């Protein structure tokens, strides 16, 4: 019943399903494995069990050679996220290969194309488009690197990226943020007046709040954004919680339209909100009163989205598959998969932040 118990169950299930050579997308450096392994490494910190560290290291060593060389999608913010595992790996081994690989990813920021105000294109293939997911793919990594190599320019970078995303995607009415924004207004989903996509897609907003919750502590003491990001998180969380499902305690694929019969409760976004809420409470960014919302979500998640197979495998269902920016019908039609890596990583990370609150509840 304790959060870490489920975290270990899911982690072991995935590690048993895939060797590091099979972890999907097989033999590719990507954020799917990056987020799952960030969870596995967070679990290693919590449990002290070596197998978790070793597995993550094995994936890193499969892709990074003796000289720190790495093959990856050179135009994607998506390629940067996995770099997050390089910091704990380096801290533990002091093996420079990880620092060298980190530098290759950090050097990408100067090569990527940008919107007129400086916002990174999500990919070369998505010209002038900023997707909320990108804040998590490239924000946290930048701050970790800034602190490792004392490169303060990276603080200004993330501050700019976040300010631009918030400026263009935040909906004043609901407080939620639209999935994407196209400065060129060329994509079919771009609102002719605002340039924003039409829906509030759960996971994307989840990556945004996870990012704010994790990045505040990486800033220098007294930095202006310690207050800005805390306030932004508080408002986003308040907005998100207004849409929590009363019955299950979970959230819908399309956040504000839970009454539509073609909508459904999605697991990865729900877990990301759980993580941000738990993290926010633990660090003091959010009032402890959110604990009830958090525990309700936890109960519903386990009760409605998890189960153990007849073979002993721990399964987390209804995780939305990889998804792009689009329209309502597109979002609700997305395949609902079991144990997809981004969702598995979100689940594990959420359990590690929840554990503390779970154990001190009532005190």
Curated annotation (Swiss-Prot):
Signal peptide residues on this chain, from the entry's feature table: none
Temperature dependence: Optimum temperature is 50 degrees Celsius. It is stable below 50 degrees Celsius.
Record site feature (May be essential to modulate pKa of the D-143 carboxyl group), residues: 31, 78
Gene Ontology CC: one annotated term: cytoplasm
Residues where substrate binds: 30-31, 78, 122-126, 203-207, 323-324
InterPro entries hit by this protein: 6-hairpin_glycosidase_sf (IPR008928), 6hp_glycosidase-like_sf (IPR012341), Glyco_hydro_88 (IPR010905), PolySaccharide_Degr_Enz (IPR052043)
Compartment list: Cytoplasm
tRNA processing found in the keyword field: no
Enzyme class: hydrolase
GO MF assignments: unsaturated rhamnogalacturonyl hydrolase activity
Keyword Lipid biosynthesis appears in the UniProt entry: no
Active site residues per record: 133
Principal localisation: cytoplasm
Listed GO biological process terms: carbohydrate metabolic process
Protein EC: 3.2.1.172
Variant or mutagenesis effect after changing residue 133 to N: Loss of hydrolase activity
Pfam families per record: Glyco_hydro_88
Disulfide bridge positions per record: none
pH dependence statement: Optimum pH is 4.0.
Function statement: Catalyzes the hydrolysis of unsaturated rhamnogalacturonan disaccharide to yield unsaturated D-galacturonic acid and L-rhamnose. It cannot act on unsaturated glucuronyl hydrolase (UGL) substrates containing unsaturated D-glucuronic acid at the non-reducing terminus, although the active pockets of YesR and UGL are very similar.
Family: Belongs to the glycosyl hydrolase 105 family.
Entry protein name: Unsaturated rhamnogalacturonyl hydrolase YteR
